[PDB]
Design a protein around this nucleic acid. Structure first.
Ligand SMILES: Cc1cn([C@H]2C[C@H](O)[C@@H](COP(=O)(O)OP(=O)(O)OP(=O)(O)O)O2)c(=O)[nH]c1=O
Ligand SMILES: OC[C@H]1O[C@@](CO)(O[C@H]2O[C@H](CO)[C@@H](O)[C@H](O)[C@H]2O)[C@@H](O)[C@@H]1O
Length: 579
DNA sequence: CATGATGCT
DNA sequence: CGAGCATCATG
């Protein structure tokens, strides 16, 4: 039983200076999506409004946009962006229950009010799936059922704010919410709604050229196999490789024969079909994901793509990007990297500006490990891969080969992920004995890294969780498991999550500090994309010289560690050219 | 919906 | 038997 007014006009008592507010968008992708209902709960009552009415009401719209009128919400960014598509500004969000729940425990996967409510045993609200249905059954119910659901969501947010802020304070996460995550949500909403302009003619032309070149490679594969088959089917490719061609079976997957990139590398000495298959797959990814996917989702009249940054998903505090994912555009191979030529500035006489932290996770490892050898390399800006090579191969600087540096780089990032000697041997295609020596030599060279790995596992066992620089937490109950595989994966999380997560906290703080400085100076430059350790902007060409100073300095100053942060930056006419 | 491939940080 | 992700075609 919950009393509410199904209102047919806006009243002053709905425009209080503290309220919980629901602006319901049912479509998972909320860009230009319908708003299906509005609810407001405040000290005066509980109200459902039809959006045709509220959003055409001058005083409701002014209330939405008034910073001083404070709103508690769940997934404020989804409402902010859906309102921006309706030309309505939402301001004054002072509590976001989605981000509060995420900070309390990202492993709960909270993605609706009822899941956040479960954290406090609050039962007076149903799950969105119970009301809307799943999958093909998804639908807005009849008004009275809809209005009840949205009012119970707003009433849950109203009641839950205090309990969640108190727990956040106990976990030292109250500033993490209010000074970091909530202001970042507003920034992301602006980046998503601005979108990134795409040169669809270039994409369509690359799609033409790739369709030709896939057909060439496909045919050569069939020639070498002496049979036509589905190169993307594991069953069919495994029959050709391992039964027709009689190659050795190096690894199995749960359902058959592995054809992983590392397996295929090991098979390449046996048959020329193996290099061709690796090539086809690379081309197939460019066509199926990047070319065909971007062209599907670009808005044709503006040529913009509008991704969604999920702020409340990863276990370490990173963002993720979806529909489309703009954080995995190709770079490594030149064929794919040219996709970046299609990412252009949204106005004439504008340029793309890309700035990236240089080796942030290795700098963070040096800070948190307090390892004297490591921190000195960064404090003196010495090439850390060369430094590691000189240690794992034991040679002077001049004796380090191109190949030695490659191996030492693999060791340096491997350590950050908890690599075993087995993994290092597979990655490098070298003797496991040798791999083990490399790791042993690393820990002898960087003994504070070894101490940190022992100490953080112990801390996880004693406290039940590990933390990052700005006090994000990840719980690791498997750290005590009797199963070797389960325990070992938890220990690698304990080692890695403070690294990866503290790097995520640093670039999020940079984004907030950068947006402040751009606004201070009244620059037209603004953020387009974040790619984990990089920020991509666009700006009038005339703003370039200012951004060359301002962007790296804000990024580098975002926090102060036991080593410097270092930012590299590039600009040009397309994202490809910003190298 | 699951699988195992690809892409990025 | 190296951390965190999204996407695709196929099963
Ligand atoms: C190899 C590797 C790179 N990266 C990321 C970090 C960098 O932002 C990005 C590009 O890596 P690189 O530029 O290849 O690495 P680096 O900056 O250490 O190398 P170099 O000294 O040779 O210039 O990829 C990972 O996150 N994990 C990895 O295992
Ligand atoms: O709105 C982003 C925000 O919503 C959640 C659900 O609370 O995720 C939904 O929307 C995403 C963006 O389209 C989808 O990818 C996802 O499938 C859907 O559940 C939160 O996870 C997210 O932070």
């Amino acid at each position: 039983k919950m009393a509410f007014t199904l209102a047919d006009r806006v009243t002053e008592e709905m425009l209080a200076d503290k309220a919980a507010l629901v602006v319901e968008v049912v479509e998972e992708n909320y860009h230009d999506a319908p708003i299906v209902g509005i609810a407001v709960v405040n000290e005066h009552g509980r109200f459902f409004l039809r959006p045709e009415t509220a959003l055409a009401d001058p005083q409701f719209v002014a209330w939405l946009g008034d910073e001083t009128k404070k709103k508690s919400m769940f997934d404020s960014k989804r409402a902010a962006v859906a309102l921006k598509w309706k030309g309505i500004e939402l301001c004054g969000v002072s509590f976001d229950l989605l981000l509060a729940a995420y900070l309390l425990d990202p492993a709960q996967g909270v993605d609706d009010v009822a899941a956040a409510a479960k954290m406090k045993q609050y039962e007076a609200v149903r799950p969105d799936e119970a009301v809307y249905g799943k999958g093909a059954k998804r639908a807005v119910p009849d008004e009275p059922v809809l209005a009840e659901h949205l009012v119970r969501k707003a009433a849950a947010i109203w009641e839950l704010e205090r309990p969640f802020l108190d727990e956040l304070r106990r976990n030292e996460q109250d500033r993490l919410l209010v000074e970091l995550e909530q202001p970042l949500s507003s920034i992301l909403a602006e980046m998503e709604f601005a979108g990134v302009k795409v040169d669809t003619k270039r994409l369509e032309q690359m799609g033409k050229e790739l369709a030709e070149q896939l057909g060439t490679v496909e045919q050569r594969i069939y020639e070498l196999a002496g049979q036509e088959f589905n190169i993307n089917s594991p069953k069919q490719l495994g029959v050709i490789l391992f039964e027709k061609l009689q190659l050795p079976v190096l690894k199995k997957t749960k359902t058959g024969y592995s054809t992983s990139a590392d397996v295929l590398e090991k098979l390449a000495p046996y048959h020329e079909i193996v290099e061709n298959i690796l090539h086809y797959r690379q081309l197939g990814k460019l066509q199926s994901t990047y070319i065909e996917g971007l062209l599907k989702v670009v808005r044709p009249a503006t040529k913009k793509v509008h991704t969604i940054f999920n702020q409340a998903l990863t276990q370490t505090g990173r963002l993720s990007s979806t529909e489309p994912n703009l954080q995995n555009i190709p770079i490594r191979l030149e064929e794919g990297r040219k996709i970046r030529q299609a990412f252009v500035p949204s106005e004439s006489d504008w340029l793309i500006f890309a700035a990236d932290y240089s080796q942030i996770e290795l700098r963070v490892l040096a800070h948190i490990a307090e390892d004297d050898n490591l921190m000195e390399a960064f404090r003196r800006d010495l090439d850390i891969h060369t430094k590691t090579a000189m240690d794992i191969f034991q040679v002077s600087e001049d004796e380090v080969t191109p190949n030695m540096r490659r191996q030492a780089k693999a060791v340096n990032y491997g350590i950050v992920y908890g690599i075993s000697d087995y993994g290092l041997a597979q990655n490098l295609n070298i003797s496991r004995k040798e791999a083990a020596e490399f790791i042993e030599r690393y820990f002898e060279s960087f003994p504070g890294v070894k101490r940190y790995m022992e100490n953080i596992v112990q801390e996880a066992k004693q406290k039940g969780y590990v933390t990052t620089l700005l006090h994000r937490r990840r719980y690791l109950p498997d750290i005590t498991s009797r199963n070797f595989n389960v325990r070992s994966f938890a220990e690698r999380m304990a080692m890695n999550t403070p690294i990866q997560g503290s790097a995520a906290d640093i670039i999020k703080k940079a984004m907030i500090d950068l947006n402040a400085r751009l606004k201070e100076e009244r620059l037209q430059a603004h953020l387009l994309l974040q790619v984990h350790d990089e920020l991509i902007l666009e700006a009038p060409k005339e703003e370039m010289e200012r951004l060359c100073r301002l962007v790296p300095e804000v990024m580098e100053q975002a926090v102060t560690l036991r080593v410097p942060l270092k930012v590299d930056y590039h600009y040009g006419s397309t994202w490809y050219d910003a190298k």
